[PDB]
């Protein structure tokens, strides 16, 4: 059960990375000391060994979205568009342990050791959601392998086997953008005519006086508190290119494949990675291959009738008792 999904981002993709990097007004990154330097947050990137016709198989940079992020996105969309309404319609509730185990895989519900029999392990691995993602105090193993997002790029020749030579991009696929923040109190003109403030024109003068006093004290000390002015930059991945996403299921039942396909159908109202306030991470699906067979049309997935019927049958009978027994035992 190999599923390969092809996507296309309409807005920039921004997956922040740890580290302290700096940029100048020009494009030079991490300059030697002695120049004006501004904080910079880059995307996520990893080194891969890409074999070229030379055969040197040197190392090249590739911009990706981590597989943990994609796995969590799939889990959250399954839990929100499928499991949550079905469970709410029956009037069911979740304890904190069951909720934490289902939504994140935490083991704090029963932090001690929880033993489980072989029949018990099989009976949970047969369950659709509990079998897809494991965890909890049992620390069971799921049947899902979620790979990371790989752009269709010449630096990804090694990861992507073949068949992607056309519509392949080359060159830089990132850009650095700048942001600002302004103090709104300083923007108050002398014409004023603003009376929403409690003190009128006296509170604003007090704010300005505190700014001036802090600046004077700092200047005297030079020869902590932070204001509202700011100037910084971050790096994003350009919009319009297409990516490849692969998901693999290990000996799955029909209900589990149906649940995966339901999540894929209910996708495209979600976002990838971060940048929430700037509408980053938008995408559209342009192809889904099911074991090599194209099952994606303009309106949803056409095919897999057995999977959809099995998942529809399995949605009924979804009760909180199984979640409580997996969480606590």
């Amino acid at each position: 059960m190999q599923i390969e999904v092809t996507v296309r981002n309409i807005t920039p993709i921004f997956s922040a990375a740890p580290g302290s990097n700096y940029i100048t007004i020009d494009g030079t990154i991490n300059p030697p000391p002695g120049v004006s330097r501004f904080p910079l947050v880059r995307t996520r990137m990893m080194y891969v060994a890409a074999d070229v016709g030379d055969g040197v198989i040197k190392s090249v940079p590739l911009q990706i979205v981590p597989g943990n992020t994609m796995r969590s996105l799939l889990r959250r969309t399954m839990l929100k568009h499928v499991i949550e309404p079905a469970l709410v319609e029956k009037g069911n509730k979740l304890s904190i342990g069951a909720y934490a185990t289902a939504y994140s895989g935490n083991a704090t519900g029963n932090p001690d050791g929880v033993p489980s029999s072989f029949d018990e392990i099989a009976t949970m691995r047969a369950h659709p959601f509990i079998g897809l993602f494991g965890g909890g105090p049992r620390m069971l193993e799921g049947r899902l392998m979620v790979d990371s997002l790989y752009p269709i790029h010449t630096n990804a020749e090694r990861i992507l086997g073949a068949g992607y030579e056309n519509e392949m991009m080359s060159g830089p696929i990132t850009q650095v953008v700048w942001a600002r923040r302004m103090d709104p109190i300083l923007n108050l003109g002398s014409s004023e005519d603003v009376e929403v403030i409690n003190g009128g024109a006296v509170a604003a003068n007090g704010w300005i006086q505190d700014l001036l006093a802090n600046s004077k004290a700092a200047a005297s000390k030079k020869k902590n508190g932070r204001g509202l002015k700011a100037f910084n930059a971050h790096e994003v991945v350009i919009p319009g290119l297409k990516w490849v996403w692969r998901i693999s299921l290990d000996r799955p039942t029909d209900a589990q494949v149906g649940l995966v396909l339901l999540a894929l159908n209910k996708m495209t109202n979600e976002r990838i990675a971060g940048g929430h306030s700037k509408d980053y991470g938008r995408f559209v699906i342009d192809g889904v291959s099911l074991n090599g067979e194209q099952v994606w049309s303009q309106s949803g997935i056409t095919g897999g009738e057995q999977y959809f019927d099995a998942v529809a049958e399995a949605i009924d009978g979804l009760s909180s008792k199984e979640f409580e027994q997996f969480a606590q035992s």
């Binding site: 002398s190 003068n205 300005i208 200047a219």
Partner: protein
């Protein structure tokens, strides 16, 4: 070294010389030492110093501006800005609804380099006449050209020495002409007046990279303009 420029916006425009008198009056009662530092007074008396004035008032569209030359001049402005802002706010709050007073500051470095070609610098509202001998020299163009000539060169030398940097002593300046002639009064409603030149153009082989002041009556905001905005004007 560097010269600090501080802008105070009261929502109205008041003249630099009038702003000087207003600041002297408002802070006359309290903190006399700070007023003396702003006004370049002698340490013991009220009479001002004869040397080059470090702190000189300037022109601003929405108020008045303060200029501080050198480390001492910058320090005086740094310690004086909050007090002046509070005084302005208190003065304008007593009468009327009340205005919001905003400030702004810059640190402009000073520089000068010698180049083998003439450069064009215009000066607005510069005072050139102080005595009868100057008036006699202004009568004939030949004897007045050299007078304005040396006045410009010596003003450059004095400001360079006061700020603490060395200037090349081989500069040759020249005077092209002036658009208008007008008088400057030290105090309002006083018969005494001082001759001045308006929109004068001077020509030096060197290039100047900061705020520079020439002529007489510098602390009243007369005859100083930024070369940087004039150098490669946008």
């Amino acid at each position: 070294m560097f010269v600090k420029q501080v802008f105070f916006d009261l929502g109205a425009r008041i003249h630099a010389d009038e702003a000087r008198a207003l600041v002297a009056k408002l802070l006359d009662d309290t903190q006399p030492g700070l007023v003396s530092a702003l006004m370049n007074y002698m340490p013991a008396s009220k009479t001002s110093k004869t040397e080059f004035p470090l702190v000189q008032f300037s022109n601003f569209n929405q108020g008045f501006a303060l200029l501080g030359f050198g480390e001492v001049g910058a320090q005086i402005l740094s310690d004086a800005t909050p007090i002046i802002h509070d005084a302005m706010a208190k003065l304008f709050a007593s009468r009327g609804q009340g205005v919001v007073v905003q400030v702004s500051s810059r640190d402009v470095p000073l520089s000068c380099e010698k180049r083998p070609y003439g450069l064009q610098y215009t000066v607005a509202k510069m005072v050139v006449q102080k005595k009868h001998e100057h008036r006699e020299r202004l009568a004939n163009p030949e004897t007045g050209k050299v007078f304005l000539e040396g006045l410009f060169l010596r003003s450059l030398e004095r400001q360079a020495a006061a700020v603490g940097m060395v200037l090349p002593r081989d500069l040759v300046v020249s005077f092209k002409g002036a658009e208008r002639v007008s008088s400057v009064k030290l105090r309002p409603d006083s018969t005494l007046a001082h001759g001045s030149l308006r929109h004068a153009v001077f020509e030096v082989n060197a290039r100047l990279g900061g705020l520079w002041s020439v002529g007489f009556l510098l602390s009243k905001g007369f005859g100083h303009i930024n070369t940087d905005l004039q150098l490669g004007q946008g």
